[PDB]
Symmetry: C5
Subunit: 338 residues, 5 copies
């Protein structure tokens, strides 16, 4: 009996097509779809993309699927039946490759309302390439977007609508290495004009704040502390060049190495990164320290002159912490504030 | 005759559906499933995930498969027959991609009890992304988890139960590079509430203890031994700066290099790692040694003063081993104990 | 009724073949096809190739598909129907591997004009290996090409024609890391003569200008600035060798390291790269500075001679900025101009 | 006529099942199988696995395939027919992924003896993860194993037997980078006890001897030669510290770098590697040389004392070559002998 | 009518088998096949293999395909028909994995002569692992080979013959990074004796000459030029150790780094590479320079002795360029000549 029902409802009998859209030659079918995301992973500045795998729940109405036969409000047909009925046909626009998970059974869910409302849920893995502005690299917030468009049909045939409530959902414990997602989520429409026609699209907004911790501990503190090691050279014995020259040249080389170190992770980019100016000024300070030693020697190796060097030492040792401090204070305001 | 039997049992004759659940419109089918793991491999902090391939043995009852025909308690149908009968439909939730092994024949096992109890065994390879707390990196125990959920049906339709005895099994000789599994294994339930309904899930616990050997030989001993090389500088000739300055600056640079070396392996993380404080204090000690030399020179280059330097040398050479030792002793207690 | 129509139009009834070309035994079918590109990504000098994913819209006429039945000018059959009708058969010649996107539905579009004009649109991802002349590496414009050829049929059977208007289209916001596409786009024919016959092909031209920003900030400025640090050595104390020798040897080593750094990114190439001469001359200048110090010492260590060294110092300090400047000016003209 | 024969032999007519084992309800079918290996490649300590692709020839008897019809002793059916007949179902146990080669035709061979003996040959590519004891890394012999088990049926149903003669065969010119296979090959049985039942398995042994050449030229000779460069410091001028200190510190740093270099290739391992002790003792010798210089200075900077330093120099220069030599001789015995 | 013809020719009607070889129970079918190569790419010493994608044109005769029906000499059936007819079954022996290109249509060509001569053309991508003798690495010519064998049938069933004219063809503009193909191409037979029987095979020869340019600019010139920088140390001030010791030790370290640099690219190999002796002798020369300085000091630090050092300086400065030159001249003869 139930076999005879699944057979009477869909398939060959009753003359039901997979190929023909629901409500053929009528107002455009609505696909009301929400996405529930499992994770973000391997977000890479280098590859310029992230991966995400999602449950996609898309709902539409079809008249000819409606039954009066069972009392139950919704029936769950086998995931295999899912191939039989017409499906709303969408791709992710920016996908750069994606796949179904076929492990064990196919991951699919199909439940038909007695009304004829159809719920269709599929688990997909996506790569997505998002352009991301690195204009300020360490402190940035990046906006990551996906847009669902119908490649099958035009605007007058098919329409996508986010769900009025709970259109995008996150896993309960979901956390990102390097990143934090913002609870505030933006959702907005788009319409694609292509040479073929105009196609519907809907796009989510994700707002990601990078974790400042790693780059603070790794990149910044050694720079700060090496500059700290640079100032003590001004304190040292006015007579002895080698100690201060060693400290200074070793610190400027170490700073050069520290600078080159950051280059490897980020993708190759035309515009100047935010960390770059920090390294330029740190390198500028240590190089200026070296220049200071060499200049004092240029004055000394030329009895009054060495006295003049004696004052330039003090005024320098007073000037550098103020210079680095005013720079520091002028610096943090831009990136960590406003 | 046996052909006619496999044909009379399942398939078109007798009106048997693959699509309809066993015991349709009744208490939720029980899937009693144990997993037998072959290996863990390529556990990577970087990629944040591991791979594991498992034999999954899942057992359920279906009434309409029950035969009286053969005397034998269990019959093994061809692995091809397996597509014909209804299967319990599960995915791994956190999978991040997985596959069947189709090499030679399909790897599948299907045996039907005369009772109608069905055993179904499939060999699967899984990637699994587990969040792992690195809060103490070198000494950590990490808990690695997989959770099986039914994407097909709701709670009232289907249920997963671990086997009362021997629910998770390990290969006889199984060993992990960098790791040791703990014989004590935890198993606990979960129920997923999704917008669609509530779905059953069961999850295993794995407790992994990292091998301290590698990081002890590689990371720690050179630090210890370089500090040992740092103390001998206090012994050396009070008159000669270059030897001690060479030893000290070379050791602080070498320590900086040793520090940067560990950074490359671990994933980029906001919170401070356990090895990090060790490197910070080692670097702090060698930098303090350099500061010591420079300070003695600052006192000397300014006949009583050099005598004062003569006492600060001794009190330092007595202080450093005690400082590093009290640090060491205070250090190990946290990570290697309690 | 509409089912009966899709069935009367194509398929078994009416005796319609997929296998037989349209207009069999007649003038060669025209495939008028435009491509709409979504992105370029991971353009790598190392792998020598780029990836691009495109919508390919190809249009041809078939007589036996023409209907009088519906009033509408174009009908959109199901993407599944697409397998049924004859398709124009093309590969990308230089592809090096490619794939369809099968995520969710197949990405396909098939619309049949009442005339019988057929529009067929498929979303494809391509790898493409383009030979690229690096003869001048940092400043180059590279021309990137794809060529569509028919592997199925000969010249007399099938022909490809770019669309008279809008044959290649770009995404509205499309931008390349390291690169800028030029709005001016060239399109030209080709005919392949193979042992089998002559096959049609059409090829696009892409003109890419590399972004000078990254290589300017990374490669050039440290060279310039290290040479700047090299000239100050001539200013320094005539009596003291160690400071100038340290500055000079450290700068020549640093320049050697900076030179080796660029080697890793580019593919291994026989002919000399444009950056190579810059590094050769920079290394030549710093090495000549070192040679200068050593030569002054060779004259001095041999009272008049040291006076001669005193003049060679000044004439050198005047000569180097002019030498590097005339080199610089002679250099930029070639690459950044004409 | 021959068509009618292939059809009368197998398939629908005569009532022949693919699903039912040969000799159903009888003694366990014998699969006598030999493997012919094409190559080993990318053997990686890091990934812990190797790849190998093999021709697998497995032979079994089936009664109902036996014909009297043709005179020829063996008939070769089309590789497509191969799906039709029952196949012995095996996986590789430790596979970690594998695949068929489907390029051009399927690679398969099926020949049926007039007796009914069936030869079935398939070309497979395997990854295989073998645990390998690195306890002595450079000089080790590693034993690499594969084990074929039947996942389909139990012990009483199916059995695997190596061929009495020529069970494993090697390609005529087969050579391994880094490795040499040993002509002596061990073959032994196994039986797997799983919760399901007991399954047959057969396993090959491979004995691989690593090539000492690479690690001798790369790792060892620079250590030996740097120690050689260390001894000459004892010869040098008793009065001049900088030359010997430069030689010594540069050599100990270079040895540290050489040591760190080897770490990158091998997988991360708890137990101490054989090369590790060599590097520890080399580093110990050069560090002891540095300690020697510093100690002589500690005695000298304190007229009799410098004479005592004068004797400790000679006795040292006599002691080091004997110490390194007795170490060397005691060292090689373990790894390169017995 | 043409439908009825494609149907009357092949398929069910007329009793035509795919499974049965052409000319069953007769002289072995000839497969006359030529290959047209598109490119070589990613030739890697590390992975030990290259990739190549080819058009494979294979031709054979079948009697039962011959028609009298159409006047045209050759008919092109749909690429789909290609599955229907019997195909000659070959693999590449050393393939290590390969694939068809299925993008858009299948890439296949099937044309049937009125004679019954069949042309069958498929576009394939191959990985191929070739053993390559690196005995002289920088200057080597490597011979790269592929061999086509029939896995399906024995020698008496099937035979492969290269085409009497134009058996291997190259793309018009085909060029290799690092390499140049030689226009002279060798083609020779092989017969494989396996335990199963004897199988036909045919193999191409490729002769590749590596481009000396890259390794000349990168590896050799810095060695030459650093030795040039080594000789000037003999010119310098007899009195001053630090300058010459700095030049010498820095150059020997730089040479050690330059040496280690080349190691990373090539696969790990037992036998000594050609570049290795060059680096050994360069390192030997710079180390001998350092030894020279130290020896002159050992003679001097011991008034006549310093005069003897004064002559050894001159005779050395005369000896080194002659030694390096006679080495150079003796060196190039082997690799770049004969």
């Amino acid at each position: 009996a139930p076999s005879e029902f699944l057979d009477k409802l869909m398939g060959k009998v009753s003359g039901y097509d997979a190929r023909i859209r629901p409500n053929f030659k009528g107002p455009p079918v609505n696909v009301t779809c929400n996405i529930f995301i499992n994770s973000f992973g391997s977000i890479a500045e280098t590859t310029m993309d992230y991966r995400v795998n999602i449950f996609l729940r898309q709902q539409w109405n079809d008249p000819r699927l409606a039954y009066s036969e069972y009392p139950d409000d919704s029936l769950d047909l086998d995931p295999s039946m899912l191939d039989s009925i017409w499906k709303p046909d969408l791709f992710f626009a920016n996908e750069k490759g994606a796949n179904f998970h076929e492990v064990t059974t196919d991951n699919k869910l199909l439940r038909i309302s007695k009304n004829g409302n159809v719920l269709y849920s599929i688990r997909i893995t996506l790569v997505l390439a998002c352009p991301m502005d690195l204009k300020n690299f360490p402190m940035d917030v990046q906006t990551c977007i996906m847009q669902l468009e119908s490649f099958g049909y035009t605007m007058n045939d098919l329409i996508f609508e986010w769900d009025e409530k709970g259109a995008v959902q996150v896993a309960d414990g979901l956390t990102l290495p390097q990143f934090i997602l913002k609870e505030e989520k933006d959702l907005r429409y788009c319409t694609k004009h292509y040479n073929t026609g105009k196609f519907t699209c809907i796009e989510a907004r994700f707002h990601l704040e990078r974790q400042m911790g790693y780059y603070l501990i790794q990149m910044y503190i050694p720079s700060l502390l090496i500059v700290i090691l640079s100032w003590v050279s001004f304190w040292i014995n006015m007579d002895a060049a080698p100690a201060r020259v060693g400290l200074g040249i070793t610190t400027v080389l170490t700073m050069t190495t520290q600078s080159s170190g950051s280059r490897a992770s980020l993708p190759k980019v035309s515009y100047v990164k935010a960390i770059d100016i920090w390294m330029a000024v740190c390198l500028l300070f240590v190089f200026s320290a070296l220049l200071e030693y060499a200049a004092v020697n240029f004055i000394a190796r030329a009895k009054l002159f060495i006295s003049r060097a004696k004052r330039i030492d003090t005024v320098s040792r007073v000037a550098f912490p103020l210079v680095f401090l005013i720079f520091n204070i002028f610096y943090w305001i831009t990136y960590k504030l406003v």
